[PDB]
Structures are given as structure tokens and as C-alpha cells.
Design a protein around this ligand. Structure first.
Ligand SMILES: CCCCC/C=C/C/C=C/C/C=C\C/C=C\CCCC(=O)O[C@H](COC(=O)CCCCCCCCCCCCCCCCC)COP(=O)(O)O[C@@H]1[C@H](O)[C@H](O)[C@@H](O)[C@H](O)[C@H]1O
Ligand SMILES: CCCCC/C=C/C/C=C/C/C=C\C/C=C\CCCC(=O)O[C@H](COC(=O)CCCCCCCCCCCCCCCCC)COP(=O)(O)O[C@@H]1[C@H](O)[C@H](O)[C@@H](O)[C@H](O)[C@H]1O
Ligand SMILES: Cc1cc2nc3c(=O)[nH]c(=O)nc-3n(C[C@H](O)[C@H](O)[C@H](O)COP(=O)(O)OP(=O)(O)OC[C@H]3O[C@@H](n4cnc5c(N)ncnc54)[C@H](O)[C@@H]3O)c2cc1C
Ligand SMILES: Cc1cc2nc3c(=O)[nH]c(=O)nc-3n(C[C@H](O)[C@H](O)[C@H](O)COP(=O)(O)OP(=O)(O)OC[C@H]3O[C@@H](n4cnc5c(N)ncnc54)[C@H](O)[C@@H]3O)c2cc1C
Ligand SMILES: [Cl-]
Ligand SMILES: [Cl-]
Lengths: 395, 395
């Protein structure tokens, strides 16, 4: 266990919160700083596959999370132009038995609040309204500086400050890479959505230069909707690219079921999709980057938060194993071994994520080949997903 | 039978020759004009699937054709970059039993000379060095005019003057549509080709913006090679586009096995690939367009000559059925019914041919989807080919 260990965490997103929980359950002294004045996430959906669900269960928060979540029966891919079913992934008992947990969807906000509360209950000291301005290593401590003039000593620091991380600059000067696709969200009361059929699945309509995703939340009361389209604005160098004026032209070619959905999206806010080129080294002395700071993906595999949750389990588990026997001295070896386990796993998600996305968005004859590939696959095979959903950091 | 029928044929390619044979065996009086001073075809390979082979057998020339032909065991598709096998079509006894004949390859010249000789032996009067300058219909005859000042009377005329048909202009003012791909050919003595493995198959290497095809001829003594690549020259408006100066850059990205092959191609002559938009009506009075005059395809399905051979059987069969009972009067009804049978069949080849070609030439993620589609298909299924190889005009 981690009794005498002091850890500081810069950033209190899903990733920071999950690390505070995982370390604090091991007996670590955890201090986390979050810039915004409250802990909060977007009131829209996210997907958490069994690779996350397992981990949440091992912290004892899955039952609670599930009580406010939705359990879809399948992931259903449809053609965005014809609305025809291309294939299904069955999320039933075979699926759960193979991967050790359910595939679920919930409100990001509720998942987030659940992790913050349990991290608090486990002993983490969380601070809102505090910006980390610098981290350096000196001797065998991490020295962390905040925007209220104070400095702080810890055994290690976690840089969990997101896609636009400033702590990343200690390790790499790369910048976010635009995909040229923008995401819009919406949650609707379920009844109030004009639906031809009912939805108890995660449904992905995939089309030339767009996609459209739908799933129920909170026991089938609301329906989460997500639209992702290639921005003509981005190619012409617009700075605030992907605005709602592009929406109607982007989906004009698509099936009515897809076009109906555009109306329910929040138009006052959207998410341009950037990621970063994969990097191998995430450690600077006694600082490690985790979460989106280390490995921000495009969202086609629905796995970025999950990756940050894995980061949390791997770090907590590996430190608990080596700290008991090696003390504060052992911290850099711990970080290196976390880095080594986590880098290939996460970097394959970033790279494969890009290829998966391109596969969704193909046109012409390429679309016809892709449709046929999907329809005719062996649905009892798990070769396309074991690497994703069947990973574990356990050694 | 066709005893009292007089038919004139403008053009003595594979298609004209095959029609002279088919009509003359029914007892028709056949006159064919060929522009060039000799009957002759390119001394390079072509492929004749069972949809052609059957028909050649029913004229009694298949045994003879096969005695100088090659019988491949499979059609093997490989990736042009890795040289990996993607899939095979088995050409064995199941294949032959289902489709009623062999898939074979031979020299175009030898197939051509075989059809000319049998058409002669069957009573067709063939004339070289004679250009048809016009065909009109007047009353119940076709009036055909030649470049030696003469005119000629017949019950019907066949416009079989090729891709660049001038007789087509009576029915349509459309022009050939460039694909932007050029084909090069080569026949090598088999031994003299540097081969890693031996080849007893039709092999197609398919790659981004190119392909490369190889098969043995004449009992495995020579190896036919064909290179097809997208011409940068064509996009920039070059008039004589697709020259051999493009070859090395076109295949630079491809596997060594593909690059080795470029060296054996004839460089003094190449074939820019044009086709035409499909048309429904091929008949002007007592003239019918057939062969490439009516339906010129891109060569990805290896079926243009075959289509002209089918044209021959269908016309001969349908006329033999209706002429015996209805005489010269019946000729326009005969042409219409030939047209109606043949148009959808051939026009699906032109359109699907284009899509098939695009499928060969895909790049990036589209290439990865296509490769995987090919590898994982059900090889006992015949759904991708029945429509092609299992067609018959018989009613
Ligand atoms: C809504 C939001 C939903 C999110 C849910 C996301 C689910 C992700 C779904 C799919 C992820 C997409 C792409 C990942 C690529 C798939 C992937 O890495 O597996 C691989 C390979 O298989 C493909 O050869 C690669 C062929 C590439 C073509 C991809 C076709 C994927 C169709 C997916 C339908 C599900 C593992 O196979 P395997 O054990 O037999 O091992 C392979 C080995 O890896 C190869 O190198 C060898 O050549 C091969 O013979 C064999 O030994
Ligand atoms: C070297 C030179 C060699 C020359 C040799 C050339 C060989 C030609 C090879 C392939 C020709 C390529 C493309 C032709 C397209 C294939 C094609 O028309 O068949 C079709 C369909 O199947 C595809 O759904 C269409 C899916 C399109 C994806 C194409 C994938 C083709 C892989 C080919 C490997 C062989 C016939 O099926 P089928 O009896 O079940 O009937 C179909 C019906 O047609 C559909 O409308 C229905 O939706 C379906 O449920 C069912 O009722
Ligand atoms: C449209 C969309 C859909 C998605 N869907 C899914 C999905 O379905 N499933 C899934 O698993 N993932 C999904 N993701 C990815 C997922 O949202 C992210 O990977 C994940 O939230 C990253 O969490 P994080 O804690 O590492 O970073 P963030 O959530 O960005 O949190 C960083 C935090 O640090 C704070 N901060 C920044 N700088 C400082 C500083 N100097 N000091 C203190 N605090 C600071 C920020 O305020 C923020 O709270 C999606 C992403 C998008 C864009
Ligand atoms: C690279 C390549 C590979 C191919 N491979 C294959 C294959 O493997 N299998 C296959 O089945 N098909 C193949 N084809 C297609 C095939 O070659 C043609 O579809 C077929 O030859 C057309 O025959 P045709 O008799 O209709 O026209 P053509 O062969 O063009 O013959 C027309 C004839 O009429 C003559 N002529 C022109 N004008 C006049 C006039 N006014 N009067 C008299 N005569 C005239 C010409 O001299 C010529 O001899 C391929 C084509 C190419 C370009
Ligand atoms: Cl994601
Ligand atoms: Cl052809």
C-alpha cells in the first residue's frame, strides 16, 4: 500500500478524479488541483466499454454508476445514406463473460461526480479554483506551483491537464493536430424525439464525410445524440471552424432519419476534433503525464476517458506493488514502468482510432467495399475487438 | 435456319468474325468487310471465361482453340504493394460443371484466325482492304456503301466497327470517355522472365492507382504480362497521354515482383483505356450495332470480346428461330429482340466494370478494407460471379 506517499494531481477531469480515487484507496496522501471553480462535466453522454467498467467495479463504484446509467443490448452500425443495418456487436452475457464487465453509457457529469465523491470519501483532498502554473523535480521530490503564489512538495506529480496541457511542454513542443471534423451533441427527452423505431442500442450511422450516433441514457428517459462531420470551413483556414451554419449542407446527402437528428443538437457549443501524434515518453523526473495530456485521441473508439481510468488503475497498482518494498526512492522506476506498460496500449488506440474513423467516412466504391465487409464478417469472432476490450494492465 | 437471308457485316475483329461464323453455320449468306489489308489481331493474351467458352464449343471450335490455349487453375488476386494473396477463384471441375465450360487464356491472334477460318469454311465471304463508308435502310433492305464506290443490298447490316465506330453516329453522338488509365502489354518466353515462383494461374496484383496481370499462354511456353496505371499526363490534358516515360514513377510504390515486370513490356505501343456510357437502343432500321460499337467496356472484367461472341450467338439463335417462320419481313422484330436481350446484360458489364476497376485501385484505409473483404469472403459462394459467368441468351 501507499501510506507514506504524497501525490499531487494537476487537473480534475475524469482522469484526475479517477487517479485521486485509485491512489487514495491504496492509502496515498493525495492533493488534487482543478482550475475551474467547480467540478463539473458536460451533461451529455459517454460510452464506457468493459475495459473501463471492470476497473470501476474494482474500485467499488460500478453498481452505483450503473444505477444511473444505461445498458445497451448492441452496438448497431447503419449506413448513413440508406439507414440499412450493416452489422451488430452483441453486448449480452457472452460479451460480458469474455471481457469481465458490461458496455454501458451514462452522463459524463454523473460519472464524474461519482468519481469525485468516492475520491473524497477515500481521503483525497480536492481543491477547485486552483491553477497549477509549474512542476519541477528537485532531488527526490516534485515541486508544484499554483496561481495563488504557493509551492507544494510531493513524491510525484501527475500532469492531467487535458488536450491543451501546458505541463506537456516540459516533454514535447508538438501541437494539437486538427482532424477537420467537428462534433455536436444533444440530449433530448426520449419521448420528444421523433423516432420511427425505438432505440435500446448504441446506434452509429456512418456516411461519406459524416456520422451520427444515438443512444439512450438514464434508464431510457433521454436519448443522447452526436453528430460528427468534415468541416469545409477548416480546409479554408477559418479559425473558429465547424460552426452550425455548416450543419445542414454536411448532412444533405444523408437519410431522413439522420437529417431529423440535426434539429435536436445544441447549436451554441461544438467540439472541433483534434488529437496528437503519439509519444513514447510521458515522464519528466517525478512528473508523469496521464489522460488526454499524454494520449488525446479522436473519439471513434469511445475510449479516451477509459484510457485515463486505465492509467489510474495501472499507476495505483504498480506503485502499491513497488512502494511497500522500496519507498520514495522507488518512484521514478514506478513511473517508467507505468509509462512502458501504458504508452503502446494507448498509442495503438490513437493510431487505430484514426484509421477506424477514416473507415466510417469513406465514399463511392470504397463505401460499397466497406459496407460489404461489415455485413459479411464472422459475428462470433472477436479478433477486431479483443485488443481493445480484452486488455488488462495486471502483471 | 437462315438459307435465304443475306447479312453484311462491317468490321472483321473478333466480333465481326464471330458473327460471320454464327450466321454462316445457320445457312445465311454472309458478306463481311474488313478495313485493314489483312485479318489480324495483337499477338498478346486475352482471357475467355466460360460465358465465351460455351459458345465456342457450340460452334465446334473450342477443342481446336484449346489445343493452342492455356487452362489456368485459378484467378489469384494479390496486393500490389506486399505481394500477399488476397483471394482465389478456383477454375477446377466444380467451376466448369456450374458454368458449362473452362476459363481459358490464349493469343488474341490465334483465337481470331480460328474464327475467321471456321467462318470461311462455313461459307462466309470475307473481304479485306474494304472500308464501309455508309449504311442506310430503304424499304426492307439495308444498303451498304464501300470505299471502292460500290453499294450492296442485304436483309440486315451489322455495325461491328469497334470502339471508334463511325456507324454508331447514326444512333448516338456520344464520344469515348477516358478512364485516365493506360494499358501496356508484353509476351515473354516464360523461361526468360525472372520469376520467384512458377505461374500456372491468372495472377492480378492490384494496387493504388495501378494493377499488374500475368498469365501463361500456349501450354506454359510464354507468359503474358499486362500493366495498367493511372496517367498523370491525362489529368493535365496531354493528347498522346500514357507514354512509357510515366511507367517507372507509376509502379515505384509497388512490390519488386511488380516492378520487375515493367521491363518486359512492349514500350513502342500502348492502349489508353476509354469506354462509353451505356445506351439502350442499338438498332437503326435494318442496321444493328454489336461488339465494341455497341458496348465498349474497360477491361477489368475481361469480357468485351466475350460480349461480342455472345452477341453473335444471340443474333444467330434468335434469327434462326423467327426467320424460318416469318422471312425477310421478320428482320426488324429480330433485331429489336436481340437488342432487348443484349442491352441490359452488356450495360451491366460496362457499369459494373467501372466499379470493379475502382475497387482494384483504392488507396489508404479503403485499400485496407478492400483487402480484408477479399481475404475473408466465403469462397464456396458464387454470388459475385453467377451474373457474369452463368448468363445465357437461351430462351
Ligand atoms: C459507436 C462507437 C463504437 C465504438 C466501438 C468500436 C469498435 C472497434 C471495432 C473495430 C476496430 C477496428 C479496427 C482494428 C483493426 C482490427 C485489429 O486490430 O485486429 C487484428 C487483425 O484483424 C485485421 O486483420 C485488420 C483488418 C482491418 C479492417 C477493419 C475491419 C473492422 C470491421 C469492424 C466491425 C466491428 C487482430 O486479429 P488476429 O488475432 O487474427 O491476429 C492477426 C494479426 O494481428 C495479423 O497481423 C495477421 O496478419 C493475422 O493473420 C492474424 O495473426
Ligand atoms: C484478372 C481479371 C479477372 C476477371 C475476373 C472478374 C471477376 C469479377 C468478380 C467480381 C465482380 C465484382 C462486383 C460485382 C458485384 C457483385 C454482384 O453483382 O453480385 C450480387 C450481390 O453481391 C453484392 O451485394 C455486391 C457487393 C459489392 C462488393 C464487391 C466485392 C467483390 C469481391 C470479389 C472477389 C471475387 C448478387 O448476389 P445475390 O444473389 O445474393 O442477390 C443479392 C441482390 O443482388 C442484392 O440486391 C441484395 O441486397 C442481396 O441481399 C441479395 O439478394
Ligand atoms: C465529442 C467527444 C466524445 C467523447 N466520447 C467519449 C466516450 O464516449 N468515451 C470515452 O471514454 N471518451 C470519450 N471522449 C474522450 C474523453 O472526453 C477524454 O479523453 C477525457 O475526458 C480526458 O479526460 P482528462 O481527465 O485526461 O482531461 P480533461 O477532461 O480535459 O480534464 C483536464 C482538467 O484539468 C483542468 N485544467 C487544465 N489546466 C489546468 C491547470 N494548469 N491546473 C489545474 N487544472 C487544469 C481542466 O479544467 C479540466 O477539468 C470524448 C471526447 C469528445 C471530444
Ligand atoms: C488491353 C485490353 C485487354 C483486353 N482484354 C480482354 C480480355 O482479356 N478478354 C476479353 O474478352 N476482352 C478483352 N478486351 C476487349 C476486347 O479486345 C474488345 O471488346 C473486342 O475486341 C471488340 O471486338 P470488336 O470485333 O467488337 O471490335 P474491334 O476488335 O475493334 O474490331 C473492329 C474492326 O472493324 C475494322 N473497321 C473499323 N472501321 C471499319 C469500317 N468502316 N469498315 C470495315 N471495317 C472497319 C477494324 O479494323 C477492326 O478490325 C481487351 C481490351 C483491351 C483494350
Ligand atoms: Cl474517445
Ligand atoms: Cl474487356
Amino acid at each position: 500500500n501507499l501510506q507514506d506517499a504524497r501525490i499531487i494531481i494537476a487537473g480534475g477531469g475524469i482522469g484526475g478524479a479517477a487517479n485521486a480515487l485509485a491512489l487514495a484507496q491504496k492509502g496515498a496522501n493525495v492533493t488534487l488541483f482543478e482550475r475551474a471553480s467547480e467540478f463539473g462535466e458536460v451533461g451529455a453522454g459517454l460510452q464506457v466499454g468493459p475495459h473501463g467498467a471492470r476497473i470501476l467495479d474494482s474500485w467499488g463504484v460500478l453498481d452505483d454508476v450503473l444505477s444511473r446509467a444505461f445498458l445497451p443490448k448492441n452496438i448497431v452500425f447503419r449506413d448513413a445514406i440508406t439507414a440499412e443495418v450493416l452489422t451488430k456487436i452483441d453486448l449480452g452475457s457472452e460479451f460480458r463473460g469474455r471481457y469481465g464487465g458490461p458496455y454501458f453509457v451514462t452522463h459524463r457529469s454523473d460519472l464524474h461526480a461519482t468519481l469525485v465523491d468516492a475520491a473524497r470519501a477515500a481521503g483525497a483532498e480536492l481543491h477547485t479554483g486552483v491553477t497549477v502554473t509549474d512542476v519541477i523535480t528537485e532531488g527526490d521530490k516534485a515541486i508544484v506551483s499554483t496561481d495563488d503564489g504557493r509551492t507544494h512538495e510531493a513524491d510525484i506529480a501527475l500532469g492531467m491537464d487535458g488536450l491543451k496541457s501546458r505541463l506537456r511542454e516540459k516533454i514535447s513542443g508538438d501541437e494539437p493536430v486538427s482532424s477537420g471534423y467537428a462534433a455536436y451533441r444533444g440530449t433530448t427527452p426520449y419521448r420528444d424525439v421523433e423516432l420511427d423505431e425505438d432505440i435500446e442500442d448504441v446506434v452509429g450511422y456512418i456516411g461519406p464525410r459524416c456520422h451520427f450516433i444515438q443512444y439512450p441514457l438514464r434508464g431510457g428517459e433521454m436519448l443522447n445524440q452526436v453528430a460528427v462531420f468534415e468541416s469545409p470551413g477548416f480546409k479554408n483556414g477559418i479559425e473558429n471552424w465547424g460552426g452550425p451554419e455548416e450543419l445542414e449542407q454536411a448532412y444533405a446527402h444523408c437519410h431522413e432519419n439522420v437529417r431529423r437528428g440535426i434539429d435536436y443538437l445544441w447549436k451554441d457549443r461544438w467540439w472541433p476534433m483534434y488529437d496528437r501524434e503519439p509519444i513514447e515518453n510521458w515522464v519528466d523526473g517525478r512528473m508523469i503525464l496521464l489522460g488526454d495530456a499524454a494520449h488525446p485521441p479522436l473519439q471513434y473508439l469511445a475510449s479516451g476517458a477509459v484510457m485515463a481510468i486505465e492509467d489510474a488503475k495501472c499507476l495505483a497498482d504498480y506503485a502499491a506493488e513497488d512502494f511497500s518494498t522500496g519507498g520514495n526512492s522507488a518512484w521514478p522506476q514506478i513511473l517508467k514502468e507505468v509509462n512502458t506498460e501504458r504508452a503502446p496500449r494507448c498509442n495503438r488506440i490513437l493510431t487505430t482510432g484514426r484509421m477506424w474513423g477514416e473507415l466510417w467516412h469513406l465514399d463511392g466504391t470504397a463505401r460499397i467495399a466497406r459496407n460489404e465487409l461489415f455485413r459479411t464478417r464472422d459475428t462470433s469472432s472477436y479478433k477486431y475487438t479483443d485488443w481493445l476490450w480484452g486488455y488488462s494492465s495486471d502483471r
